[PDB]
Symmetry: C3
Subunit: 231 residues, 3 copies
């Protein structure tokens, strides 16, 4: 399946596909997330189940997002953009928006992992569960007094640290590894074409590496990769 | 003692008490500190022994804070607010304010750990000593060209990344773990009431965890188990 | 050799020399770099082989920097200052500027490690190679759309988080460890004088550590043991 193929790729491989096939200059990268609870295996990949948090004074009612987390999803939480910043810590609240009971439930429902564009708490609990969680940072405090979830399966706008606000839609493919988080925009991407290119790119990259290990200069090795991938 | 009871709580549990018993919206959290030298147990707790630093040209004389660190303290160092920032690295100097010899002495004096709202140096020495140290970051250089300690057991004002300045008073309880640092204001707190609440809240959440692992939805479990907390 | 002598020192020991011998208030520290691919040994040292990156629209041609990395170098990459920031993430691009293939070639050439004033990609590849790399952060994306290398062995200017811009020249000595990165500016300092001082200072600080473990107050011990350093 789509997911299965993507699970074999690093986030770097996926960005090479997005950059070179779709001319996306950032390669679909969402920067400055840390794997607080790392995946056991190489990467996590899944379809985005998005959740939007707003100030508690917002007129929209609080929603229960966690109890409907889909199997094989990546659960993706974000704040209203006014509470985001272009500089670390990247959000303007000190409270966490997601803790260990949330990971417990998401794991029960067979989610592949969580990306929080904000803070998590109960660091050791996520790790003990072995539930993968990426976040900007950590907190000790529940969100009660400041924010609440107001939307699920909505578009998420993320103010990134290059000044550009990038978006994540429901059903987008999310991949995370030690290089961070990438998103494949499913509306706009022919997954077969992308996967085919990425597979070839991995083959060619491996040969650049082996060229170098065998004493061939990088310039020559990179030139030959370019020549191959051109076609 | 209450310190012994607090030692068994995570910082999240303590924040649950401060938020719910005292309506402290941030739950006493001081954000963005890293456990550069981590606790040997889960958490550290102690009474705040505060130390304020200022520019070297300030007329307040330099003080020797390290040699009077009390037993069972948490040693807490901060700069004046004008040297702090709401954005990482959270302070405007690159020099460290605290090194390996400092931990050696603080530990000798039986301090429970250090929190530096600034940079520390000699990372490997703190770690070899197993002396817990939380800080904003690290440096390589001593502070003497730029800042000095000018006060002990004074109020510390910490400009935090939500824009709000929070305070730490001498004798406040400070707790630290992998979630960061929380402070309990002791002048404004009935510690017994707070400890009792936190106990009950911990109990509730263990029960919720069990429920969720048994296939009960989180909302249902939380609403069922947490009802009892209102009367504490 | 100089590098062999420096290899025995922590970055803190080196900053002690730069601060005390040369009155360099920051001790040559370049702040906020993380050891994303940590050294196997305690520290890395080498002579700086510098690489400057600029926007792709810059009139200078892209260059091949990696195939000429010298043995025993530290490869140092930086952006033009206008692409830098005083706050994290310290650069204004999300793309990586250095990946796994570059460490592969640098390692082949016997470079001692890399410092990137920017983001690196292929985290696991550097680690698998056991090639030391310090950087501001990570990325997943190649730099093709945004920046290119435009010079080698040119001056680098680093806007640091205290607001001061500090420079790195080819042939400067670079040291890195868990405290971060320090640079010895060889055209402003005498290496033999610095090495001699540092060696003495390390001995002094050992004695202070042992004094503190004997119950001697730290500042007293410092003043006593460090008196010998005054003549230098």
């Amino acid at each position: 399946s789509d997911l299965q193929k993507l699970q074999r790729f690093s986030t770097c491989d996926i960005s090479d596909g997005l950059l070179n096939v779709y001319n996306i200059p950032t390669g679909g990268y969402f920067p400055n997330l840390t794997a607080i609870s790392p995946p056991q295996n190489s990467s996590i990949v899944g379809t985005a189940y998005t959740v939007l948090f707003a100030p508690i004074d917002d007129p929209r009612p609080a929603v229960n997002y966690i109890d409907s987390v889909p199997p094989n999803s990546i659960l993706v939480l974000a704040l209203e953009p006014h509470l985001q910043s272009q500089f670390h810590p990247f959000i303007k609240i000190t409270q966490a928006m997601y803790g260990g009971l949330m990971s417990t439930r998401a794991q029960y429902l067979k989610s592949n992992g969580t990306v929080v564009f904000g803070r998590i708490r109960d660091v050791d609990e996520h790790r003990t569960l072995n539930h993968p969680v990426f976040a900007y940072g950590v907190g000790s405090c529940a969100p009660k007094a400041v924010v609440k979830a107001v939307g699920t399966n909505v578009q998420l706008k993320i103010l990134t640290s290059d000044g550009v606000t990038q978006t994540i839609c429901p059903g987008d493919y999310i991949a995370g590894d030690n290089n961070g988080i990438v998103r494949i925009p499913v509306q706009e991407t022919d997954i077969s074409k992308l996967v085919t290119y990425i597979e070839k790119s991995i083959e060619v990259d491996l040969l650049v590496s082996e060229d170098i290990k065998n004493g061939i200069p990088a310039k020559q090795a990179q030139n030959d990769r370019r020549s191959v991938l051109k076609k």
